[PDB]
Amino acid sequence: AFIEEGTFLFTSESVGEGHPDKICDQISDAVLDAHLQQDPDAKVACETVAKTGMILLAGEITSRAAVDYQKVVREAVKHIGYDDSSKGFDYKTCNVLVALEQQSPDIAQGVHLDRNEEDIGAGDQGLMFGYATDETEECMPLTIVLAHKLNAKLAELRRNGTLPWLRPDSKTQVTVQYMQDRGAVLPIRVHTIVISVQHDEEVCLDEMRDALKEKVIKAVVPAKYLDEDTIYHLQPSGRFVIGGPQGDAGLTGRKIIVDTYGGWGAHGGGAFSGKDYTKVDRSAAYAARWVAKSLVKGGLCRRVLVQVSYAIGVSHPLSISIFHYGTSQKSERELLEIVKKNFDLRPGVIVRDLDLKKPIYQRTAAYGHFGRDSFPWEVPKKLKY
Amino acid sequence: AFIEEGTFLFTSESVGEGHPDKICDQISDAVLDAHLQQDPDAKVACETVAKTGMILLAGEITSRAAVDYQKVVREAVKHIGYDDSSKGFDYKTCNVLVALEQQSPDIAQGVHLDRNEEDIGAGDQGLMFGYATDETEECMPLTIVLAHKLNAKLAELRRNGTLPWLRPDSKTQVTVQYMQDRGAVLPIRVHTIVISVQHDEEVCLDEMRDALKEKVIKAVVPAKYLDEDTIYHLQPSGRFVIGGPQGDAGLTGRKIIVDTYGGWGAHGGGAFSGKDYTKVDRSAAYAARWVAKSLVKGGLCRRVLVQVSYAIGVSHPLSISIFHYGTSQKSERELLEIVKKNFDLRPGVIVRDLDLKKPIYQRTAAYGHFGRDSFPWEVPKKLKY
Numbered sequence: 001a002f003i004e005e006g007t008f009l010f011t012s013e014s015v016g017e018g019h020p021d022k023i024c025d026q027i028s029d030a031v032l033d034a035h036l037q038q039d040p041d042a043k044v045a046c047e048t049v050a051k052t053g054m055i056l057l058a059g060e061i062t063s064r065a066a067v068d069y070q071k072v073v074r075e076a077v078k079h080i081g082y083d084d085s086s087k088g089f090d091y092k093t094c095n096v097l098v099a100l101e102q103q104s105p106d107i108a109q110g111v112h113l114d115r116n117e118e119d120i121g122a123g124d125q126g127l128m129f130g131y132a133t134d135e136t137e138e139c140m141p142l143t144i145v146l147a148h149k150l151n152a153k154l155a156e157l158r159r160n161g162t163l164p165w166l167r168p169d170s171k172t173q174v175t176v177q178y179m180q181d182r183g184a185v186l187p188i189r190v191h192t193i194v195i196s197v198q199h200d201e202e203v204c205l206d207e208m209r210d211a212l213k214e215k216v217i218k219a220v221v222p223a224k225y226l227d228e229d230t231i232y233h234l235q236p237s238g239r240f241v242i243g244g245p246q247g248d249a250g251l252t253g254r255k256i257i258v259d260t261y262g263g264w265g266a267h268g269g270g271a272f273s274g275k276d277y278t279k280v281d282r283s284a285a286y287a288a289r290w291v292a293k294s295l296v297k298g299g300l301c302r303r304v305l306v307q308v309s310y311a312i313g314v315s316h317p318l319s320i321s322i323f324h325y326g327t328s329q330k331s332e333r334e335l336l337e338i339v340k341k342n343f344d345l346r347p348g349v350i351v352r353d354l355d356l357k358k359p360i361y362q363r364t365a366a367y368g369h370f371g372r373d374s375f376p377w378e379v380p381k382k383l384k385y
Numbered sequence: 386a387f388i389e390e391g392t393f394l395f396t397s398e399s400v401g402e403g404h405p406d407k408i409c410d411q412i413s414d415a416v417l418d419a420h421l422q423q424d425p426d427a428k429v430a431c432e433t434v435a436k437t438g439m440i441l442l443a444g445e446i447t448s449r450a451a452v453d454y455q456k457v458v459r460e461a462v463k464h465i466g467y468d469d470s471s472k473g474f475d476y477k478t479c480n481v482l483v484a485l486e487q488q489s490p491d492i493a494q495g496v497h498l499d500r501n502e503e504d505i506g507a508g509d510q511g512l513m514f515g516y517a518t519d520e521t522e523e524c525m526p527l528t529i530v531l532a533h534k535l536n537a538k539l540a541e542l543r544r545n546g547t548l549p550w551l552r553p554d555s556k557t558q559v560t561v562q563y564m565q566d567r568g569a570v571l572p573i574r575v576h577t578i579v580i581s582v583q584h585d586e587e588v589c590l591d592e593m594r595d596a597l598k599e600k601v602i603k604a605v606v607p608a609k610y611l612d613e614d615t616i617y618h619l620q621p622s623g624r625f626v627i628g629g630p631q632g633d634a635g636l637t638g639r640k641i642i643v644d645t646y647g648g649w650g651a652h653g654g655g656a657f658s659g660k661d662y663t664k665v666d667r668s669a670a671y672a673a674r675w676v677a678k679s680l681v682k683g684g685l686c687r688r689v690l691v692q693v694s695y696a697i698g699v700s701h702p703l704s705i706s707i708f709h710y711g712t713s714q715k716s717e718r719e720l721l722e723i724v725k726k727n728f729d730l731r732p733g734v735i736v737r738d739l740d741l742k743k744p745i746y747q748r749t750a751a752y753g754h755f756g757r758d759s760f761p762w763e764v765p766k767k768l769k770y
């Protein structure tokens with residue numbers, strides 16, 4: 001397809017609830033939630049690893065909670081849908097191994113011991129970005145929104161029994177052509193869609209490809225974006241019976257771009273799942289999203305990127321910067337002043353503003369952390385200036 | 386510090402060879418190299434997990450090689466410097482566990498079985514970006530270059546015995562103020578430096594902070610970038626005796642931004658280490674770097690971002706796009722035509738151009754994959770147009 005000057009292509013991907021990396025993210029956040037339900041101040045850094053027959057928890061937790069890891073892990077796998085050896089993985093019969101220790105006392109003393117909550121230090125150094133774009137109501141890139149919705153539709157049709165050959169492991173990828181608009185972007189058309197999904201031994205390739213087009217793509221992607229030139233790669237490997245952890249090892253924090261903006265904006269490298277609010281990889285990224293979305297919904301920008309960074313043990317961010325892509329009449333200095341007057345990005349203040357001791361994290365761990373369900377970081381702050 | 390209009394701050398981080406995530410990347414690539422030394426066509430997808438006393442290998446390998454995983458893992462840990470219980474980890478006495486299976490036959494049949502090498506399919510779907518910037522000779526952002534060099538200097542002074550209290554686990558972070566220059570960027574000054582490094586029980590905080598400034602920062606960062614306003618956070622946690630996997634679990638592919646551009650450019654989410662060339666997460670990212678660097682060294686751009694993407698089982702990229710930040714006199718269409726005429730981004734052609742069956746991967750797995758050592762993707766292609 002021809003690319004008119006002033007237009008361009010961009011691609012993002014998403015994965016389903018049973019993708020092995022996403023299994024790990026969901027388990028790590030189920031463990032976090034289980035701790036927070038009993039101890040709102042639990043210090044949690046839980047990594048999960050998945051391979052054939054195995055969930056391993058590894059990391060550091062200091063908490064007053066009494067958590068039954070066997071039950072928490074197995075219930076999370078059950079929810080995903082891995083409930084029989086015929087599907088490659090079974091919550092009832094898999095191995096759950098635990099290698100969890102207390103948080104390092106050296107970290108604890110440098111971050112939170114004997115500190116006023118508002119003045120707790122960042123739990124690590126790092127950099128984080130927030131992004132928002134007015135191209136969708138939820139202020140997310142269309143590429144990633146569509147990719148997530150394709151995976152959600154697969155899970156829906158698996159769970160409602162209308163495509164009973166589906167299994168839980170899936171991946172999708174969407175390329176959209178955009179029009180430049182004074183620094184903002186406007187979606188024009190869908191250029192290419194990829195869908196791969198684990199399936200039973202009985203269904204044939206043609207039946208699957210027809211269903212993926214008619215029952216999945218057409219039920220998700222508006223027809224105005226699809227044309228005779230759109231390219232479809234549906235079950236492009238030809239066979240995907242082996243899947244889940246049996247097909248590919250999973251680890252927590254290996255889908256960080258799926259979790260955020262689908263490649264748009266920028267990313268500082270930190271993973272979200274399995275971490276309590278003192279880990280700024282999560283809390284500061286959520287707050288940076290909240291700032292970005294507040295700037296767009298407040299009418300100050302159409303598209304905006306925010307970078308923050310921290311040093312371990314230091315509460316205030318080391319610096320904050322705002323880039324508006326040419327979509328604000330205010331200068332970068334002016335936007336920064338507005339942000340500094342309206343937000344306090346210490347982790348011990350973010351926790352209060354975004355209610356980050358609440359056990360809602362398992363809900364964040366599939367289909368992206370941003371752009372859905374009116375989580376606190378998705379509710380814009382009314383800005384004073 | 387005041388930010389003049391037309392200037393801005395940007396932050397990147399790096400980690401040392403003994404950071405637990407980086408340990409895992411290095412082990413995963415040591416395993417890959419060991420296979421490639423005997424079987425250049427080995428199919429390798431090796432994840433590593435590290436916690437107190439434990440290295441676990443998990444993933445999928447199909448290979449004609451006979452690899453002694455105990456020896457390969459322990460020699461990699463020895464090289465890093467974890468050789469005694471007093472340091473928190475010891476290659477001689479740790480547990481090495483292996484959960485490695487063959488590559489899924491369903492993947493194999495859809496990717497490479499009975500396919501001409503040049504026509505092998507991508508080993509997965511995904512998106513990848515390449516980036517280059519003329520702000521340094523090696524065409525990398527100064528923020529990340531400096532951050533890497535600070536970690537390398539720590540390892541040097543540990544190994545040469547002049548700072549014998551140092552241990553292998555470290556992290557660094559550098560914020561630079563830049564001047565905008567017609568889409569390119571020009572470094573002005575270093576705004577903030579963070580250094581945290583594991584240390585012995587005997588050395589005091591003041592001795593460490595003085596050494597980190599005088600022997601590390603001053604030996605790495607040109608004095609012209611440092612002034613009386615530069616902020617230093619040196620050992621900001623106050624105590625870092627517990628470190629390595631004992632302090633924090635490590636996993637392969639959890640430092641993907643450290644491995645690439647330090648937050649500049651863009652990232653598609655895929656990890657590099659532990660993967661052979663058929664995994665486009667690695668090979669196509671390397672090729673995209675090669676394209677970007679070729680465009681800058683060829684005088685066509687000063688700063689450039691390239692996105693490619695793939696579907697599993699399909700050899701050619703689904704699309705390619707080039708963004709030059711306003712730093713080329715050529716249009717995006719023209720640059721794309723030049724790229725298409727000069728490069729072939731099928732994985733089975735990338736392998737030949739970049740010599741990706743060679744066992745050099747362990748060398749890539751610390752201090753970034755880009756900007757050093759004249760690896761094949763760092764040697765620009767002479768462009769014809």
Ligand SMILES: COc1ccc(-n2cc3cnc(NCC(F)(F)F)nc3c(-c3ccc(Br)cc3)c2=O)cc1
Binds near residue numbers: 008185
């Ligand atoms: C005057 O209004 C505008 C509005 C938007 C743009 N604009 C144009 C682009 C063209 N082509 C690519 N290719 C993707 C690439 F990865 F290959 F670069 N990207 C672009 C981007 C972009 C850059 C980085 C990221 Br992250 C995400 C999008 C872009 O903002 C220009 C002028």
Ligand SMILES: COc1ccc(-n2cc3cnc(NCC(F)(F)F)nc3c(-c3ccc(Br)cc3)c2=O)cc1
Binds near residue numbers: 307393565566567649
């Ligand atoms: C006319 O010449 C130029 C030359 C460069 C720029 N330019 C300016 C920026 C200002 N401020 C931030 N803050 C970091 C932020 F994360 F908060 F946005 N970034 C910027 C960037 C930028 C954007 C995304 C990424 Br990735 C990396 C750098 C930038 O290119 C503008 C005009």
Ligand SMILES: C[S@@+](CC[C@H](N)C(=O)[O-])C[C@H]1O[C@@H](n2cnc3c(N)ncnc32)[C@H](O)[C@@H]1O
Binds near residue numbers: 019243429446
């Ligand atoms: C292709 S596998 C990664 C490569 C792999 N580790 C190997 O050994 O070659 C990555 C993801 O793709 C999906 N996948 C697994 N088997 C597949 C298949 N046969 N066809 C298509 N996608 C598959 C799963 O979501 C999986 O987590």
Ligand SMILES: C[S@@+](CC[C@H](N)C(=O)[O-])C[C@H]1O[C@@H](n2cnc3c(N)ncnc32)[C@H](O)[C@@H]1O
Binds near residue numbers: 629
């Ligand atoms: C701070 S730890 C991550 C948080 C952690 N998992 C916990 O339980 O709170 C992340 C990295 O910081 C470094 N680190 C570990 N202990 C530290 C300490 N006491 N002071 C500073 N940095 C430390 C190591 O490089 C480690 O991999």
Ligand SMILES: [Cl-]
Binds near residue numbers: 509
């Ligand atoms: Cl994957």
Ligand SMILES: [Cl-]
Binds near residue numbers: 124406
């Ligand atoms: Cl880390």
Ligand SMILES: [Mg+2]
Binds near residue numbers: 044045275279
């Ligand atoms: Mg953590």
Ligand SMILES: [Mg+2]
Binds near residue numbers: 266
């Ligand atoms: Mg963007």
Ligand SMILES: [Mg+2]
């Ligand atoms: Mg940009």
Ligand SMILES: [Mg+2]
Binds near residue numbers: 430660
């Ligand atoms: Mg792989």
Ligand SMILES: [Mg+2]
Binds near residue numbers: 649650651
């Ligand atoms: Mg950039």
